[PDB]
């Protein structure tokens, strides 16, 4: 019953493992626990500003996935839609394996494959993956200044690493999804996110560029995990040194937009999104997604074998995959406190959130550390679970 959340965060700051941390836990749509620890940057020790801004990386994916579900509801496409219907550059895909064998794909990539990371795409930083070296040579993630549409043209020429539908591998497929959304609608994904999600939820600080007053609110990002170079064979030491993002994550590029990363947000903005996922509605009662399609989106859809869900061989114990991210399907296999049906996702800079329908609960932890050797997100979830009976 003590405040384990503050204890976790203060200990991380006091041990020089994270510069600054913010968190909020809501229940029934209202804050029940919240706090902050540390500073905006350790170089000057400026205090965490009001409505501090974070690079949320793959916490972009549940947002872009939710947009796709809205467009499915509105009839733009369906889960079974072949993506080549919208961009013929994804016609005639090939599949490569670890033995240098290449053959034509025997199934078409669908919207559902993109949402479930079963399309056969890879990721630039996937260690040991048969094709990731070719992704890195193409600078798919590193070259943030390249237009989404043009990056997709380069990706489309590369082989998949399995036949669509047959395996699971966490991937660039959410970026493909953002692009296919643009093809299917004739609109830009950032404009669609603004009009259909951010504005109805009053997420005024969320987007692919900083707000006008955003520079002074941007949290510094730390860590040794590097985008420029080969995936490491052992984790870099966990040290608070400012991270060099190269040109991968611009702050003021009006055309920068992605599906798998790239949003800036705030704790308050992301909690508005997370709370919405408990119902599909805005706080006033506008429906962003009907209950039936929200249930379709949250139902466990990819189930895993004995070794479970893994990303670069890191486990997500007891989790299955739904159309928006992870979902807890076996508390008896879980590695940290949770409840059946808890869902959410996380980002490369150690941001983390969850939604727990059994407790009408949402939680989010914001920090900026790339390559963390400490699972701060899960530690904060566990603390909150222990505090909510």
Choose between 206 and 338: whose C-beta lies nearer to a copy of itself. Answer: 338
The contact pattern for ligand 9KL, residues 348-377, with x = CB under 6 A and - = no contact, is x---------------------x-------
34 binds, among ligand 9KL, a copy of itself, none (CB under 5 to 8 A by kind): none
Choose between 9 and 141: whose C-beta lies nearer to ligand 9KL. Answer: 141
Choose between 81 and 206: whose C-beta lies nearer to a copy of itself. Answer: 81
DSSP 195: I
Given a contact cutoff of 8 angstroms between Cβ atoms, the answer to whether 337 and 343 are in contact is no
Cα–Cα dist 249/301, whole Å = 31
| Strand blocks (E) in 238-370 | 264-266, 309-311, 314-316, 319-322, 325-328, 343-346, 352-356, 361-366
- Site membership for ligand 9KL, residue 310 (CB under 6 A): no
- Site membership for ligand 9KL, residue 148 (CB under 6 A): no
Q: For residue 279, give the nearest of 374, 201, 174, 376 by alpha carbon.
A: 201
Sole binder of ligand 9KL in the list 19, 33, 58, 160 (CB under 6 A):
58
Cα–Cα dist 177/124, whole Å = 17
Sole binder of ligand 9KL in the list 141, 156, 193, 297 (CB under 6 A):
141
How far CA 79 is from CA of 7, 72, 75, 130, 139, in Å, comes to 44, 7, 11, 28, 29
Length of the chain: 389
Choose between 77 and 118: whose C-beta lies nearer to ligand 9KL. Answer: 118
Cα–Cα dist 259/269, whole Å = 18
- Site membership for ligand 9KL, residue 248 (CB under 6 A): yes
Report phi then psi at 200, rounded to 5: -60, -30
Choose between 56 and 70: whose C-beta lies nearer to a copy of itself. Answer: 70
Sole binder of ligand 9KL in the list 24, 89, 257, 261 (CB under 6 A):
261
Report phi then psi at 354, rounded to 5: -145, 160
Choose between 111 and 141: whose C-beta lies nearer to ligand 9KL. Answer: 141
| Residue bearing tokens 């493992």 | 17
Q: Interacting stretch for ligand 9KL, rule CB under 6 A, among 114-122, 223-231, 286-294, 359-367? A: 223-231
Sole binder of ligand 9KL in the list 159, 207, 347, 363 (CB under 6 A):
347
200 binds, among a copy of itself, ligand 9KL, none (CB under 5 to 8 A by kind): none
Sole binder of ligand 9KL in the list 12, 18, 23, 57 (CB under 6 A):
57
For residue 366, the minimal CB distance to ligand 9KL (Å) is: 14
For residue 343, the minimal CB distance to a copy of itself (Å) is: 12
Choose between 146 and 261: whose C-beta lies nearer to ligand 9KL. Answer: 261
Question: What contacts 135, CB < 8 A, 6 or more positions away?
Answer: 122, 123, 124, 126, 141, 155, 158, 172
Report phi then psi at 28, rounded to 5: 55, 30
For residue 97, the minimal CB distance to a copy of itself (Å) is: 6
Q: Interacting stretch for ligand 9KL, rule CB under 6 A, among 25-33, 221-229, 233-241, 314-322? A: 221-229
Choose between 79 and 192: whose C-beta lies nearer to a copy of itself. Answer: 79
Whether the CA torsion 271, 272, 273, 278 is positive or negative: it is positive
- Site membership for ligand 9KL, residue 222 (CB under 6 A): no
- Site membership for ligand 9KL, residue 227 (CB under 6 A): yes
57 binds, among a copy of itself, ligand 9KL, none (CB under 5 to 8 A by kind): ligand 9KL
Per rule CB under 6 A, count of chain residues that contact ligand 9KL: 13
Q: Facing residues of 186 across strands?
A: none
Choose between 129 and 263: whose C-beta lies nearer to a copy of itself. Answer: 129
DSSP 345: E
301 CB neighbour count, 10 Å cutoff: 18
Given a contact cutoff of 8 angstroms between Cβ atoms, the answer to whether 163 and 95 are in contact is yes
Q: For residue 347, give the nearest of 275, 260, 254, 239 by alpha carbon.
A: 260
Sites of contact with ligand 9KL (CB under 6 A) = 57-58, 125, 141, 225-227, 248, 260-261, 347-348, 370
């Amino acid at each position: 019953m003590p405040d384990l959340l503050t204890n976790v965060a203060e200990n991380y700051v006091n041990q020089d493992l994270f510069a600054g941390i913010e968190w909020r836990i809501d229940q029934d749509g209202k804050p029940i626990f919240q706090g902050c620890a540390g500073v905006k940057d350790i170089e000057t020790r400026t205090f965490i500003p009001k409505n501090a801004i974070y690079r949320i990386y793959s916490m972009t994916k549940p947002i872009v996935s939710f947009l796709a579900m809205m467009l499915i509801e509105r009839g733009v496409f369906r889960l079974s839609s072949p993506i080549q219907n919208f961009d013929p550059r994804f016609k005639s895909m090939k599949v490569i394996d670890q033995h240098a064998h290449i053959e034509p794909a025997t199934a078409l990539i669908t919207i559902e494959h993109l949402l479930t990371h079963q399309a056969g795409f890879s990721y630039d930083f996937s260690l040991g993956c048969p094709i990731s070296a070719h992704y890195r040579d193409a600078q798919l993630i590193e070259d943030g200044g390249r237009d989404l549409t043009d990056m997709m043209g380069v990706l489309a020429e590369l082989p998949l690493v399995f036949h669509p539908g047959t395996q699971w591998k966490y991937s660039i497929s959410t970026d493909v999804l953002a692009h296919i959304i643009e093809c299917a609608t004739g609109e830009r994904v950032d404009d669609l996110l603004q009009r259909l999600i951010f504005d109805p939820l009053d997420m005024q600080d969320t987007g692919f560029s900083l707000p006008l007053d955003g520079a002074s609110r941007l949290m510094e990002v730390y860590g040794m995990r590097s985008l420029a170079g080969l995936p490491a064979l052992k984790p870099a030491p966990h040290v608070l040194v400012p991270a060099d993002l190269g040109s991968s994550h611009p702050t003021d590029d009006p055309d920068f937009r992605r599906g798998g990363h790239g949003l800036y947000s705030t704790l308050d903005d992301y909690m508005a999104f997370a709370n919405m996922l408990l119902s599909g509605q805005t706080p006033e009662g506008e429906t962003l997604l009907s209950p039936a399609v929200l249930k379709l989106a949250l139902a466990p859809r990819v189930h895993f074998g004995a070794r479970g869900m893994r990303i670069n061989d890191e486990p997500f114990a007891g989790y299955s995959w739904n159309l928006l991210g992870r979902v807890m399907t076996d508390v008896g296999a879980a590695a940290y406190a949770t409840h059946l049906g808890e869902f959410g996702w996380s980002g490369a800079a150690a941001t983390y959130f969850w939604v727990d329908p059994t407790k009408n609960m949402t939680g989010c932890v914001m920090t900026q550390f790339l390559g963390s050797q400490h699972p701060i997100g899960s530690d904060m979830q566990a603390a909150a679970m222990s505090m909510l009976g």
